[PDB]
Motif scaffolding. Structure first.
Motif, PDB file in Angstrom:
ATOM      1  N   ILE A  25       0.826  -1.205   0.000  1.00 35.44           N
ATOM      2  CA  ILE A  25       0.000   0.000   0.000  1.00 35.44           C
ATOM      3  C   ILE A  25       0.861   1.256   0.000  1.00 35.44           C
ATOM      4  CG2 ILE A  25      -1.713   1.295   1.326  1.00 35.44           C
ATOM      5  CD1 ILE A  25      -2.785  -1.476   2.244  1.00 35.44           C
ATOM      6  N   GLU A  26       2.020   1.219   0.662  1.00 36.41           N
ATOM      7  CA  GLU A  26       2.927   2.360   0.570  1.00 36.41           C
ATOM      8  C   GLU A  26       3.559   2.455  -0.815  1.00 36.41           C
ATOM      9  OE1 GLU A  26       6.116   1.953   3.463  1.00 36.41           O
ATOM     10  OE2 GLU A  26       6.598  -0.051   2.707  1.00 36.41           O
ATOM     11  N   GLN A  27       3.809   1.316  -1.464  1.00 37.20           N
ATOM     12  CA  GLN A  27       4.357   1.346  -2.815  1.00 37.20           C
ATOM     13  C   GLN A  27       3.312   1.775  -3.839  1.00 37.20           C
ATOM     14  OE1 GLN A  27       6.138  -2.896  -1.809  1.00 37.20           O
ATOM     15  NE2 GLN A  27       7.050  -2.145  -3.720  1.00 37.20           N
ATOM     16  N   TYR A  28       2.033   1.460  -3.597  1.00 34.97           N
ATOM     17  CA  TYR A  28       0.977   1.871  -4.519  1.00 34.97           C
ATOM     18  C   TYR A  28       0.919   3.385  -4.676  1.00 34.97           C
ATOM     19  CZ  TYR A  28      -1.034  -2.882  -4.214  1.00 34.97           C
ATOM     20  OH  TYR A  28      -1.258  -4.238  -4.260  1.00 34.97           O
ATOM     21  N   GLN A  29       1.286   4.129  -3.637  1.00 35.11           N
ATOM     22  CA  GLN A  29       1.094   5.572  -3.664  1.00 35.11           C
ATOM     23  C   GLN A  29       2.046   6.288  -4.619  1.00 35.11           C
ATOM     24  OE1 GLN A  29       0.450   5.395   1.083  1.00 35.11           O
ATOM     25  NE2 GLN A  29      -0.085   7.372   0.167  1.00 35.11           N
ATOM     26  N   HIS A  30       3.003   5.580  -5.223  1.00 34.71           N
ATOM     27  CA  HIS A  30       3.829   6.168  -6.268  1.00 34.71           C
ATOM     28  C   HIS A  30       3.125   6.199  -7.618  1.00 34.71           C
ATOM     29  CE1 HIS A  30       7.523   6.403  -3.856  1.00 34.71           C
ATOM     30  NE2 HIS A  30       7.150   5.251  -3.330  1.00 34.71           N
ATOM     31  N   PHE A  31       2.067   5.413  -7.793  1.00 33.45           N
ATOM     32  CA  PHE A  31       1.437   5.244  -9.093  1.00 33.45           C
ATOM     33  C   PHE A  31       0.359   6.294  -9.331  1.00 33.45           C
ATOM     34  CE2 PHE A  31       3.135   1.085 -10.362  1.00 33.45           C
ATOM     35  CZ  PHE A  31       3.710   0.687  -9.166  1.00 33.45           C
ATOM     36  N   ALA A  84      -9.670   0.276 -11.648  1.00 35.00           N
ATOM     37  CA  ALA A  84      -9.223   1.006 -12.831  1.00 35.00           C
ATOM     38  C   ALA A  84      -7.714   1.214 -12.813  1.00 35.00           C
ATOM     39  CB  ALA A  84      -9.949   2.347 -12.931  1.00 35.00           C
ATOM     40  N   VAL A  85      -7.142   1.486 -11.637  1.00 38.43           N
ATOM     41  CA  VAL A  85      -5.691   1.630 -11.548  1.00 38.43           C
ATOM     42  C   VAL A  85      -5.006   0.283 -11.744  1.00 38.43           C
ATOM     43  CG1 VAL A  85      -3.789   2.206  -9.997  1.00 38.43           C
ATOM     44  CG2 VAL A  85      -5.748   3.718 -10.158  1.00 38.43           C
ATOM     45  N   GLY A  86      -5.655  -0.801 -11.336  1.00 34.76           N
ATOM     46  CA  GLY A  86      -5.069  -2.121 -11.413  1.00 34.76           C
ATOM     47  C   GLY A  86      -4.533  -2.661 -10.108  1.00 34.76           C
ATOM     48  N   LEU A  87      -4.980  -2.127  -8.968  1.00 31.54           N
ATOM     49  CA  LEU A  87      -4.491  -2.577  -7.673  1.00 31.54           C
ATOM     50  C   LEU A  87      -5.095  -3.902  -7.244  1.00 31.54           C
ATOM     51  CD1 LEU A  87      -4.785   0.847  -5.806  1.00 31.54           C
ATOM     52  CD2 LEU A  87      -2.838  -0.041  -7.101  1.00 31.54           C
ATOM     53  N   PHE A  88      -6.241  -4.278  -7.810  1.00 28.69           N
ATOM     54  CA  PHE A  88      -6.982  -5.462  -7.406  1.00 28.69           C
ATOM     55  C   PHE A  88      -7.246  -6.355  -8.609  1.00 28.69           C
ATOM     56  CE2 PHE A  88      -8.450  -2.745  -3.806  1.00 28.69           C
ATOM     57  CZ  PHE A  88      -8.040  -3.573  -2.776  1.00 28.69           C
ATOM     58  N   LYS A  89      -7.170  -7.663  -8.386  1.00 29.34           N
ATOM     59  CA  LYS A  89      -7.572  -8.658  -9.369  1.00 29.34           C
ATOM     60  C   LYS A  89      -8.944  -9.199  -8.980  1.00 29.34           C
ATOM     61  CE  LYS A  89      -6.476 -13.254 -11.183  1.00 29.34           C
ATOM     62  NZ  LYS A  89      -6.772 -12.817 -12.581  1.00 29.34           N
ATOM     63  N   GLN A  90      -9.905  -9.087  -9.892  1.00 27.67           N
ATOM     64  CA  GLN A  90     -11.268  -9.534  -9.623  1.00 27.67           C
ATOM     65  C   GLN A  90     -11.384 -11.036  -9.866  1.00 27.67           C
ATOM     66  OE1 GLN A  90     -13.894  -5.838 -11.271  1.00 27.67           O
ATOM     67  NE2 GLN A  90     -12.115  -6.450 -12.495  1.00 27.67           N
ATOM     68  N   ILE A  91     -11.946 -11.748  -8.899  1.00 28.22           N
ATOM     69  CA  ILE A  91     -12.025 -13.204  -8.921  1.00 28.22           C
ATOM     70  C   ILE A  91     -13.501 -13.595  -8.857  1.00 28.22           C
ATOM     71  CG2 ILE A  91     -11.480 -15.363  -7.736  1.00 28.22           C
ATOM     72  CD1 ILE A  91      -8.952 -13.985  -6.690  1.00 28.22           C
ATOM     73  N   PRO A  92     -13.989 -14.436  -9.770  1.00 26.03           N
ATOM     74  CA  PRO A  92     -15.384 -14.883  -9.683  1.00 26.03           C
ATOM     75  C   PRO A  92     -15.615 -15.745  -8.453  1.00 26.03           C
ATOM     76  CG  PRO A  92     -14.209 -16.107 -11.377  1.00 26.03           C
ATOM     77  CD  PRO A  92     -13.300 -14.993 -10.945  1.00 26.03           C
ATOM     78  N   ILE A 109      -2.606  -6.867  -5.873  1.00 24.85           N
ATOM     79  CA  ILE A 109      -1.657  -7.167  -6.936  1.00 24.85           C
ATOM     80  C   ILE A 109      -0.290  -6.634  -6.536  1.00 24.85           C
ATOM     81  CG2 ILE A 109      -1.037  -6.686  -9.330  1.00 24.85           C
ATOM     82  CD1 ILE A 109      -3.969  -6.772 -10.034  1.00 24.85           C
ATOM     83  N   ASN A 110       0.734  -7.454  -6.744  1.00 21.38           N
ATOM     84  CA  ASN A 110       2.104  -7.071  -6.431  1.00 21.38           C
ATOM     85  C   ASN A 110       2.494  -5.821  -7.218  1.00 21.38           C
ATOM     86  OD1 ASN A 110       4.971  -6.988  -6.023  1.00 21.38           O
ATOM     87  ND2 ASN A 110       4.948  -9.195  -5.636  1.00 21.38           N
ATOM     88  N   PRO A 111       3.037  -4.792  -6.563  1.00 22.76           N
ATOM     89  CA  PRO A 111       3.407  -3.566  -7.291  1.00 22.76           C
ATOM     90  C   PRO A 111       4.462  -3.766  -8.367  1.00 22.76           C
ATOM     91  CG  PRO A 111       4.088  -3.505  -4.965  1.00 22.76           C
ATOM     92  CD  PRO A 111       3.118  -4.616  -5.108  1.00 22.76           C
ATOM     93  N   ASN A 112       5.368  -4.739  -8.224  1.00 29.49           N
ATOM     94  CA  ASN A 112       6.314  -4.973  -9.312  1.00 29.49           C
ATOM     95  C   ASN A 112       5.619  -5.547 -10.541  1.00 29.49           C
ATOM     96  OD1 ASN A 112       6.010  -7.788  -8.808  1.00 29.49           O
ATOM     97  ND2 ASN A 112       7.744  -7.777  -7.373  1.00 29.49           N
ATOM     98  N   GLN A 113       4.426  -6.125 -10.371  1.00 24.94           N
ATOM     99  CA  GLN A 113       3.590  -6.493 -11.504  1.00 24.94           C
ATOM    100  C   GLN A 113       2.863  -5.292 -12.100  1.00 24.94           C
ATOM    101  OE1 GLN A 113       2.680 -10.322 -11.915  1.00 24.94           O
ATOM    102  NE2 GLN A 113       2.393  -9.618 -14.031  1.00 24.94           N
ATOM    103  N   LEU A 114       2.641  -4.239 -11.311  1.00 25.09           N
ATOM    104  CA  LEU A 114       1.977  -3.047 -11.831  1.00 25.09           C
ATOM    105  C   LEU A 114       2.867  -2.279 -12.798  1.00 25.09           C
ATOM    106  CD1 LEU A 114      -0.049  -1.437  -8.937  1.00 25.09           C
ATOM    107  CD2 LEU A 114      -0.864  -2.579 -11.004  1.00 25.09           C
ATOM    108  N   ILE A 115       4.155  -2.130 -12.473  1.00 28.13           N
ATOM    109  CA  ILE A 115       5.033  -1.325 -13.318  1.00 28.13           C
ATOM    110  C   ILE A 115       5.215  -1.950 -14.691  1.00 28.13           C
ATOM    111  CG2 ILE A 115       6.247  -0.314 -11.356  1.00 28.13           C
ATOM    112  CD1 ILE A 115       8.425  -2.237 -11.659  1.00 28.13           C
ATOM    113  N   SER A 116       4.859  -3.219 -14.847  1.00 26.05           N
ATOM    114  CA  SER A 116       4.877  -3.871 -16.149  1.00 26.05           C
ATOM    115  C   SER A 116       3.484  -3.830 -16.767  1.00 26.05           C
ATOM    116  CB  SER A 116       5.367  -5.315 -16.026  1.00 26.05           C
ATOM    117  OG  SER A 116       6.664  -5.367 -15.457  1.00 26.05           O
TER     118      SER A 116
END
Length: 116
Positions: A25-31, A84-92, A109-116
């Protein structure tokens, strides 16, 4: 995935508890797009997740933890922005009691997966 009792779809969207999410959550705040209201929602999920008995936290649990200050519409609004940002993966999801409806499970979602 199967949700077991006492949880039902009346409780709203679900969030999967993650100890690693504390530092994410602290890493998310860079995005771009990660607002303070989104950070507030994820911090509440983390704190409420500490007392989770089944590794889950529901929207209703988040509302009750704020004495109604954080409403369901406010949670769903911040959730759409977070997805919309991509912080969460929706699971049925499927409940053993009642229908699933539009209720979904959300995984951090892992932030190192976000930067890609």
């Amino acid at each position: 995935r199967l949700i077991k009792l006492p949880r039902t779809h009346k409780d709203g969207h679900l969030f999967e508890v993650s100890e690693a999410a504390i530092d994410w959550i602290e890493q998310y705040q860079h995005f771009k797009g990660v607002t303070k209201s989104i950070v507030e929602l994820m911090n509440l999920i983390s704190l409420r997740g500490l007392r989770s008995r089944d590794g889950l936290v529901s929207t209703t649990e988040l509302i009750d933890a704020t004495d109604g200050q954080l409403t369901r519409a406010a949670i769903q609004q911040r959730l759409r922005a977070a997805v919309a940002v991509g912080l969460f993966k929706q699971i049925p999801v499927r409940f053993e009691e009642g229908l699933a409806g539009k209720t979904m499970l959300h995984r951090f979602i892992n932030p190192n997966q976000l930067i890609s």
